[PDB]
RNA sequence: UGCGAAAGCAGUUGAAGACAAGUGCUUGUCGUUCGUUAAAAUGGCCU
């Protein structure tokens, strides 16, 4: 059954988002609403809405904390020079609107990410808020009090990021910043160290990328329950305006710094707006908000497109979100008619 | 910089001062997050939290220099509002109570001590505790007739405490000083923001007057003269602020204080007018127009004297028809319709104008028979319908120059139900070797309406500075603990 | 539909434990009825195929006992959060239904089998298979005492069958469609009900005869009765709960519901009940506020009406009120600022509320209140005209012009010299009329106010008079 | 912590005459337009229902002009001789005119060409025609025969009833709201006479004894009517036959009268008085007739209207002069691709269960005074003090500010000859006004004290300095002529 | 038929007698951070961060130990110098609700702000001799104080390890370190 | 500082010790004591 066909939105959904350890779904779009949903595939009803008033919904991902797992938040961002954060342990909402010298390079807080970050002065973590800015900066903000911990710069006009988890040790890990620009190169910072720059390379055939995507591992996706779960990602998906996916293995790609993609994919022709992996990365799901029923699932390793789904009849519409079930192998597709369809995959 | 705190991992350093302004310093960029516009200056930051998700600071409020109003305020990180803000009453003694040092500045200034400044002033105001003759330090508070809610005057602004819950309700300036817009630094301390100096109630609870200087400020032709402004504030049951209807700017002439307002009874205009009386010998009447919509002064007695005295004191019969108007140490009677003295066409045992031993500090006219008056000396019950002095108490030995010019309407009180009198006598604590202490004792006695009989007798370990009776057979009193306590059935 | 597929009470029902699907996974929770914390513990089946089909409490170790769909019956342990044993009848049938008589645990396949096991010694005692009993999917044990001797099966009519000889005793005409209820209400009658039937049959389990039927006024979920036969009640597919006060002490033959209960919140949306419980004098209503969340009420079903609705609170259209913040948004800690706003501000000086002569036209400009006329008259300038025409003027409109001469002046600042000869000679001339009406402050209010500001401002003036005199003096001798 | 307070503005205590709310509501009567006609406009009258349009009788003349563009859209000129008084139904469908040979002429009201009713009322000049306003049957006409008549619309034959008893000259009558029966008639003997049309009719059921000949009656209430004649009008109340008020607020005879009821105003009713002197002034009813508003024009005005209360747009105040003249006074009153991209903003979201609401709402814009003493930039405040085209008022709340921050000499720290001249500008004529001379007075002598020594070297300060000189010895001599005349009003009250 | 009664007052107590320290805080969150606990002169008051209400309200009046110490009307010096979350006396105990009180003199309260009071709260006493305790360090279960003394107005530190006793049933304390003329401290 | 209306009316800041700087001498300073009633580190306020 449809994820929120039992209250129907008046947008399109703009972001679609799992709860990382319940039957939950959050959705948001530009008529300001932010709705959970209990999914149970058969009646999927509404838990609860929440009306932001002045404040559009670009992107909205629940976030759980790894060292205390009652500590769930919503984060929640539009055009707006502010964010908010919902507290869903009357409701607690918060406004991240200080940005602590740096709101000339953050003039919009809509294209943010959430990540774990460990401070190894105690081996404590805590959860970081990314913001894409102009400029090629990407400010970097605590979770909880919102003071700016670092920036990154990458040169030219930058088009996507994304979060790598490396384990170091038992209950160590680092966290690294991938930051691609429209160009094709892409640099790697070491949140841990001032937020250095590991490594830098560039996309073989490169032009016009708008999505930079890590799986296999832990993702911002799917995230961690705890330190010890964190693992590293397999694949890297790099997703352009003309249609273009180039899959890199991380392991033989991390070496080169100018490395060459296992596979280029062009079923699509139109821009890459959506890169999602499985929670195990073997299905890659790329999909296109430019036209209608532009999704493909993609076997990995083998890095071939399903060919009986989707299918002619496949009611998708014009895809702007795509989420993957943590645990249940479940696919939640939203689109511009405000639909979020459900679909299972049988072998999860 | 009066409170440095550094964060946990040490990126960040809060700091805080004599600007009320509380900044956030990144040690690597060197830019700073300020929240400005404080409650007081910041004499304590800290950070909270296992992420710092919090920040805990201690204000004080330097404006006051009677007392120090410390506020404790626990911040939300993220928002920087407050998650919590602590407070006790904020009541403006007369003169600084025992042990209270202005904090460390740059310079010497009246909020503020300087380096050199302190270990002087600490024995000097020590020394001026063992050694001085007068020793007030009353505050005036008022009740609310509707809530119940004490207001404290507190400068510029006014806290409104709600006594039952121990906690505070609101906090509004009623001034156009600078007030809250800046945090004054330097030579800025030596501004005086506009003192409220009078607050009352009409006796229905719709209307609040406040009577307030203004001071200007140093090194000009106008820095001698003074403001003199009439406020009159309205507010509905359902909201907590008040709204300013009419402002009378020198309402009793150029620069001639009000030293004595009182609201009148319900019978004169469903209590909507008041009555302010100067120094000069002069009584106004304001009520409430409606068609005007406004506070319209309505009668007026002139002055015309050459005799200035601030021991003035006023009282209003229950029907409105007799004004008592105590003037240095004359009390006369006046009839309100023609707002004149009373005179009487037999001429016959009615004799309006009463000569006393000493200065009166409070009338109290208990019921339409009943009159109490307060000198310098003696406390008297005048029976108004025999015309005749029931009794007389000697209150020389304790009121004898501890208290300046009309703060023993602060210490009487009287119930207006049951006619019951309060009175607060504070002595200070003697030496063996007979130097007075620096603690104090107070003694409540409650008399009846005729002061024949003491009703009640009660003593108290510390000094009280206001007694007033709650519109149902309460008497609160304020110690200068900053605590509240009642003496009823 | 509903999201929580099964559902029941402990015996007392103090305690409610339901079947929910999170994602693709059953779960089974337990929450208190009782308002006097919520229980996060959740029992997960793995296996995604693996379904609840039938679950009963057990009243050392409080369990309740869960049939699964593989052919395993579950003793689940809800303090341990673990299933502690898991019984199974050695064939990969579901389990249709279950029942437990201390130590004694019942229940039937999916192939129309029967199966008694045991609960201390953990053992499958027998298993048999009845002639006659095909398609059977309930089943109960007929209380005969401690010893166990009888059993009531139902597919869609009613066999009772006693357990040593294997065989049917008496049979029962029930439903037309499956029976989804079988209990017995005392030893002398028990109850059916059916999968969208309205109807409840209740049979004497001696005679075989149908005492009486029960009509719901929608199809029937769940039945509940008190321990004495004196009360049932069920919760429809409406969401309603319908109570029948003394069914079986007695038009005879069909009876209805005495009490109806429905569950309305305040903006007007219906909630629908599952799962009630009923006592002596007490009922307990279940309801699930967010999508999964039940929420329980205890009610007095002898003191209310015969039609009730129970009003709870629901968040629509919420305001979301913040405690930190006040009612307009902003800070608690926050002081109110100063403003003035619209306010009259005012002075204590305004004392209200306390031939070629131009006569004839002055006159009717003030009886007219004309000010083109007025200012007409205003514009002569001579002595003996100004002063003649006062003369002239009456008495009365003596008082007027004064007013309208000081609105004037007030308001014009450079007319106040050329109208002081008006004003001065209005006073010269009509003095004695001035002295002999009363309330003069009063009628000249606005000339009193005028001249005491003007007067008022004179030590200032006198002041900067001497300072600019020092500088002038100083730069002249310089 | 706490959001910043705006500067206050100085407001200083208020002088008398201070603008009265109807008199900021009737001063918005600004556009004036003036049409010469022929010879006297007699009457002036309202259509009661939509566009309210307005007739206006001249001689030989009847126009209708438009609310909207105050232009006249019909004219009817078919009488033979001066018509006098043209009036609408309470529909508005009929115009009935009256003419100086008797007749009564009804016609469509926007169609000139046809006349539906004609009407020979008498031999003597008909000046009154008005229709019943309960009744859309019945049409009064008075005349100079002494008799006024009231026809049937349907039978015009005859009269349906005739009401005589008036010994001079009926030129005006009314019609009682709530009683449909009343006719109140006001003639040159002064009286009054109000007729039950129930009864015989011949002679009244009572009179009312306003001394002047009666130019105009109306009724602002089922109880009380207006009765104008002479420079004073009286309101009456109907059931105690007696006069409630009688304001004589004029120099000339009282025309006409006009009256309206809940337009939208601060004053909810309104009494429209003109008379021969030039004066059209408004009457409060609810304040016991107290004077509001007035205009005066360029001769004696016969006639007056106001919009009606219904008027859903312009509204005009309206006035017919005995020269010719008519003065009309008004109050004025992305593809289906992208929408459907970005369709949600305008939800406000009423299916939600809870609402948030923290969105910052824009305030009014700091001034740059303002954000100078917020910035804590005291010589540029005091330099955006004085600038060309500033008010008064905000250049004294710079000064007063500065002064109560303490910042006079900071402010004036580092000034030139050249900087220092737009303040002693501004001082010029500081020194004159009462509010603002003792801030002028510590300004300037703060001045003096710290650029003293720059006089001997600058001339234009010098002049600047004698000039505010010769400025504060005639402020000087006005505060003591204002104090000797004080002293005269003492010794007159006293 | 008169009785007076004090009732309704506040004062938030400072850490400020000293006035040469650089924290003057004594009021603590509590271990969940629902709940934060305030000195005052005449009273303990405990808040709900969520809520911003008084939740409990530990007056020294109605208790007669707290009375005894606090209310002395002989010497006003005592004063509550720290607040520990738990019980110090007590290991191994989560101790939710109980926080431990150290005054000037070095009395040593076990109270509990949620429920109602115990009639005779944990009591010791700190052997100090010619000493006022400033403050109070707990660290892994390892404790020091603070104490000013005097042998110029500075006075002098001297720093304690502190242990608790569980035979003896009382605290004891080493001499770990000592400086003279402090003037300020942080 | 004391009293007094706001105006005003009377009254007053002494020692000691230590240190610094200049050159035993001179001067200043005081997180010093005792006695009397007695300016200035380019450093300005959030979203």
């Known amino acids: 059954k449809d994820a929120n066909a039992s209250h129907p939105s008046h947008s399109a959904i703009q972001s679609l988002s799992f709860h990382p350890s319940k039957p939950l779904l959050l959705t948001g779009g530009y008529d300001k609403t932010l709705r959970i949903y209990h999914i149970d595939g058969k009646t999927n009803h509404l838990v609860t809405s929440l009306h932001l008033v002045g404040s559009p919904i670009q992107t909205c991902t629940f976030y759980t904390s790894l060292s205390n797992q009652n500590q769930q938040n919503i984060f929640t961002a539009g055009r707006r020079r502010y964010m908010h954060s919902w507290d869903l342990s009357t409701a607690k909402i918060e406004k991240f609107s200080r940005l602590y010298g740096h709101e000339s390079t953050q003039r919009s807080f809509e294209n943010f990410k959430v990540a774990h970050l460990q401070n190894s002065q105690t081996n404590s973590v805590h959860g970081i808020v990314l913001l894409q800015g102009n400029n090629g900066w990407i400010n970097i903000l605590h979770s909880t009090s919102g003071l700016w911990l670092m920036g990154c710069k990458i040169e030219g006009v930058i088009t996507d990021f994304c979060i790598d988890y490396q384990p170091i040790s038992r209950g160590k890990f680092r966290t690294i910043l991938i930051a691609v620009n429209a160009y094709g190169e892409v640099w790697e910072f070491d949140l841990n160290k001032n937020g250095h720059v590991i490594r830098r390379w560039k996309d073989q055939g490169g032009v016009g990328i708008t999505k930079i995507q890590v799986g296999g591992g832990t993702t911002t996706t799917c995230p961690a329950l705890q330190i010890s779960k964190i693992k590293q990602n397999r694949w890297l998906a790099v997703g352009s305006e003309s249609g273009f996916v180039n899959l890199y293995d991380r392991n033989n790609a991390m070496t080169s710094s100018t490395p060459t993609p296992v596979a280029a994919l062009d079923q699509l022709t139109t821009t890459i ?76 | 910089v009066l409170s440095l705190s550094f964060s946990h991992d040490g990126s960040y350093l809060l700091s805080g001062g004599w600007e009320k302004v509380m900044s956030l310093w990144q040690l690597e960029t060197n830019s700073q997050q300020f929240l400005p516009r404080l409650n007081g200056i910041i004499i304590d930051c800290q950070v909270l939290g296992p992420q710092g998700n919090y920040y805990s600071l201690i204000l004080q409020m330097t404006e006051n220099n009677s007392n120090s109003d410390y506020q404790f305020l626990l911040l939300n990180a993220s ?241 409105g028809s007799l004004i008592f108007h105590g003037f240095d140490d004359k009390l006369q009677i006046l009839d309100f319709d023609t707002f004149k003295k009373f005179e009487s066409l037999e001429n016959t045992k009615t004799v309006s104008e009463f000569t006393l031993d000493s200065e009166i500090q409070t009338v109290k006219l208990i019921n339409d028979t009943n009159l109490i008056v307060a000198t310098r000396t003696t406390l008297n019950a005048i029976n108004l319908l025999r015309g005749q002095v029931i009794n007389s108490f000697d209150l020389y030995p304790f009121v004898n120059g501890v208290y300046k010019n009309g703060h023993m309407d602060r210490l009487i009180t009287c119930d207006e139900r049951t006619g019951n009198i309060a009175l607060v006598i504070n002595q200070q604590l003697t030496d063996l070797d007979g130097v007075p202490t620096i603690n104090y004792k107070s003694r409540i006695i409650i008399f009846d309406s005729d002061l024949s009989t003491k009703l009640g007798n009660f003593t108290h370990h510390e000094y009280i500075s206001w007694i007033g009776w709650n519109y149902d057979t309460d008497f609160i009193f304020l110690d200068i603990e900053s605590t509240l306590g009642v003496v009823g059935t | 539909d509903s999201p929580v597929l099964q559902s029941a009470y402990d015996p007392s029902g103090q305690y409610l434990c339901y079947v929910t699907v999170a994602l693709d996974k059953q779960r089974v929770g337990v929450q208190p009825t009782q308002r006097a914390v919520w229980n996060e513990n959740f029992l997960y089946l793995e296996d995604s195929k693996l379904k609840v089909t039938c679950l009963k409490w057990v009243n050392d170790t409080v369990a309740i006992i869960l049939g699964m769909n593989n052919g395993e019956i579950w003793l689940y342990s809800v303090l341990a959060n673990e299933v502690t044993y898991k019984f199974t009848t050695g064939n990969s049938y579901e389990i249709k239904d279950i029942d437990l008589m201390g130590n004694q645990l019942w229940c039937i396949d999916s192939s129309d089998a029967f199966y008694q096991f045991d609960l201390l010694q953990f053992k499958l005692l027998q298993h048999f298979r009845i002639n006659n009993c095909v398609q059977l999917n309930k089943l109960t044990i007929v209380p005969a005492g401690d010893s166990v001797a009888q059993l009531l099966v139902a ?39 059916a999968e969208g039937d309205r109807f409840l049959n209740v049979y004497d389990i001696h005679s075989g005869m149908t005492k009486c039927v029960l009509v719901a006024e929608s199809d029937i979920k769940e039945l509940s009765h008190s321990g004495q036969a004196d009360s049932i009640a069920v919760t429809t597919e409406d969401g309603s709960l319908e109570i029948f006060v003394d069914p079986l002490v007695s038009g005879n033959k069909s009876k209805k519901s005495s009490k109806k209960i429905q569950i309305v919140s305040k903006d007007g949306r219906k909630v629908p009940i599952y799962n009630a419980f009923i006592n002596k004098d007490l009922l307990n209503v279940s309801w699930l506020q967010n999508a999964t969340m039940p929420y329980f009420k205890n009610l007095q079903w002898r003191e209310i009406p015969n039609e009730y609705t129970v009003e709870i609170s629901l968040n629509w259209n919420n305001k979301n009120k913040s405690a930190d913040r006040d009612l307009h948004g902003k800070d608690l800690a926050s002081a109110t600022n100063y403003v003035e706003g619209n306010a009259r501000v005012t002075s204590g000086d305004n004392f209200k509320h306390v031939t070629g002569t131009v006569t004839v036209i002055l006159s009717q400009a003030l009886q007219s209140n004309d000010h083109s006329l007025l200012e007409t008259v205003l514009n002569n300038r001579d002595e003996r005209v100004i002063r003649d025409t006062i003369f002239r003027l009456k008495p009365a409109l003596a008082v007027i012009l004064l007013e309208r001469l000081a609105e004037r002046i007030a308001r014009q600042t450079h007319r106040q010299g050329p109208l002081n000869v008006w004003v001065k000679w209005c006073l010269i001339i009509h003095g004695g009329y001035l002295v002999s009406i009363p309330n003069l402050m009063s009628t000249l209010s606005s000339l009193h106010s005028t001249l005491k500001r003007r007067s008022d401002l004179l030590p200032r003036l006198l002041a900067l008079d001497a300072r600019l005199d020092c500088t002038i003096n100083k730069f002249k001798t310089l | 912590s706490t959001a910043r307070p705006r500067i206050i503005t100085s407001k200083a205590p208020l002088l008398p005459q201070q603008t009265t709310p109807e008199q900021r509501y009737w001063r918005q009567y600004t556009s004036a337009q003036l049409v010469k006609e022929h010879n006297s406009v007699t009457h002036i009258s309202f259509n009661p229902q939509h566009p309210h349009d307005f007739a206006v009788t001249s001689s030989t003349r009847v126009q209708i002009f438009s609310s909207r563009t105050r232009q006249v859209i019909k004219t009817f000129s078919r009488f033979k001789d001066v018509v006098y008084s043209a009036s609408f139904r309470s529909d508005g469908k009929l115009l009935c005119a009256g003419d100086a040979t008797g007749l009564v002429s009804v016609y469509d009201s926007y169609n000139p060409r046809t006349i539906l009713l004609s009407i020979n009322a008498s031999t003597h000049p008909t000046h009154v025609t008005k229709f019943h306003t309960q009744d859309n049957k019945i049409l009064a006409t008075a005349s100079d025969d002494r008799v006024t008549r009231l026809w049937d619309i349907s039978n015009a034959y005859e009269p349906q009833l005739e009401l005589t008893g008036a010994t001079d000259y009926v030129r005006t009558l009314s019609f009682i709201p709530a009683a449909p029966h009343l006719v109140a008639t006001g003639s040159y003997d002064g009286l009054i006479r109000l007729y039950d049309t129930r009864s015989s009719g011949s002679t009244p059921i009572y009179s009312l004894n306003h001394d002047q000949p009666v130019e105009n009656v109306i009724a602002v209430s089922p109880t009380q009517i207006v ?152 010589s540029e405040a005091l330099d955006n003090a004085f600038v060309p085209g500033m008010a008064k008022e905000l250049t004294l709340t710079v000064l007063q500010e500065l002064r109560k921050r303490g910042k006079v000499r900071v402010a004036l720290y580092g000034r030139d000859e050249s900087t220092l001249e737009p303040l002693l500008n501004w001082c010029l004529k500081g020194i004159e006004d009462v509010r603002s001379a003792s801030i002028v007075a510590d300004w300037v002598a703060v001045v003096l004290e710290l650029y003293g020594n720059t006089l001997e070297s600058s001339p234009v300060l010098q002049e600047l300095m004698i000039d505010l000189k010769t400025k504060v010895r005639h402020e000087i001599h006005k505060s003591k002529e204002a104090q000797r005349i004080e002293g005269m009003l003492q010794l007159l009250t006293s | 038929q008169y009785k007076l009664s004090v009732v309704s007052g506040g004062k938030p107590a400072l850490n400020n007698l000293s006035s040469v320290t650089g924290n003057k805080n004594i009021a603590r969150l509590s271990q969940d951070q629902r709940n934060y606990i305030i000195p005052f002169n005449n009273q303990i008051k405990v808040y709900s961060v969520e809520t911003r209400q008084c939740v409990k309200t530990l007056k020294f009046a109605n208790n007669s130990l707290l009375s005894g110490i606090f209310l002395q009307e002989e010497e006003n010096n005592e004063s509550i110098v720290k607040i520990l979350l738990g019980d110090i006396t007590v290991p191994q105990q989560e101790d939710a609700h109980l926080i431990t009180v150290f005054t000037n003199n070095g009395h040593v309260i076990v109270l509990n702000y949620k429920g109602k009071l115990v009639e005779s709260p944990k009591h010791f006493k700190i052997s100090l001799a010619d000493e006022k305790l400033a403050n109070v360090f707990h660290s892994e279960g390892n404790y020091r104080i603070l104490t000013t003394f005097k042998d110029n107005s500075l006075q002098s530190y001297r720093l304690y390890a502190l242990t608790f006793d569980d035979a003896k049933k009382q605290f004891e304390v080493a001499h770990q370190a000592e400086w003279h003329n402090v003037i300020l401290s942080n």
């Open chain 1, 273 to 348: 707006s959506n890169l999602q992996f499985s929670p195990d990365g073997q299905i890659l799901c790329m999909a296109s908000r430019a036209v209608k029923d532009a999704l493909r699932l993609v076997h990995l390793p083998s890095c071939s497109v399903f060919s009986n789904w989707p299918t002619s009849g496949t009611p998708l519409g014009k895809v702007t979100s795509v989420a993957f079930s943590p645990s249940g192998g479940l696919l939640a597709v939203g689109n511009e008619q405000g639909k979020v369809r459900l679909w299972k995959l049988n072998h999860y």
């Open chain 4, 227 to 378: 009765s104008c004649g002479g420079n004073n009008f009286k309101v009456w109340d109907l059931t105690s036959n007696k006069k409630l008020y009688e304001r004589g607020n004029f120099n000339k005879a009282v025309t006409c009268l006009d009256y309206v009821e809940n337009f939208d105003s601060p004053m909810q009713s309104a009494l429209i008085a003109s008379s021969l002197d030039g004066h059209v002034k408004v009457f409060d009813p609810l304040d016991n007739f107290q004077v509001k508003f007035g205009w005066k024009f360029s001769g004696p005005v016969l006639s007056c209207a106001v919009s009606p209360s219904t008027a859903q747009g312009n509204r005009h105040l309206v006035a017919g002069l005995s020269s010719g003249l008519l003065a009309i006074r008004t109050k004025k009153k992305k593809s289906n691709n992208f929408q459907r991209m970005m369709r949600g903003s305008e939800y406000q979201g009423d299916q939600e269960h809870i609402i948030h609401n923290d969105k910052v709402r824009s305030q009014r814009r700091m001034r740059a005074f303002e954000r100078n003493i917020n910035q804590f930039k005291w």
């Open chain 3, 155 to 193: 597919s869609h009519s009613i066999s009772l069958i006693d357990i040593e000889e294997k065989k049917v005793v008496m049979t029962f005409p029930g439903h037309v469609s499956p029976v989804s209820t079988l209990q017995v209400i005392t030893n002398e009658f028990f109850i059916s009900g």
């Open chain 2, 79 to 319: 928002d920087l509002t407050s998650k919590l803000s602590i407070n006790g009453p904020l009541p403006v003694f007369n003169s600084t109570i025992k042990h209270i040092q202005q904090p460390i500045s740059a310079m010497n200034t009246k909020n503020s001590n300087s380096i050199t400044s302190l270990n002087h002033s600490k024995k000097k105001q020590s020394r001026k505790l063992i050694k001085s003759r007068r020793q007030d330090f009353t505050t005036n508070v008022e009740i609310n007739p509707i809530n119940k809610n004490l207001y404290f005057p507190h400068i510029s602004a006014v806290q409104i405490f709600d006594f039952y819950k121990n906690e505070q309700v609101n906090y509004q300036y009623l001034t156009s000083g600078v007030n809250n817009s800046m945090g004054k630094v330097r030579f800025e301390l030596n501004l005086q923001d506009p003192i409220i100096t009078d607050l009352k109630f009409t006796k229905d609870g719709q209307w609040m007057i406040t009577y307030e200087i203004e001071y200007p400020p140093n090194d000009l032709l106008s820095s001698k003269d003074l403001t003199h402004i009439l406020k009159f504030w309205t507010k509905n049951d359902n909201e907590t602020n008040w709204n300013l209807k009419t402002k009378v700017i020198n309402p009793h002439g150029i620069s001639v204080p009000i030293t004595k307002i009182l609201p009148s009874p319900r019978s004169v205009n469903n209590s909507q007018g008041c009555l302010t009386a100067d120094n000069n010998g002069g009584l106004k009447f304001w009520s409430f127009d409606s068609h005007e919509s406004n506070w319209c002064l309505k009668k007026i007695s002139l002055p015309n004297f050459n005799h200035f005295s601030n021991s003035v004191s006023l009282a209003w019969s229950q029907d």
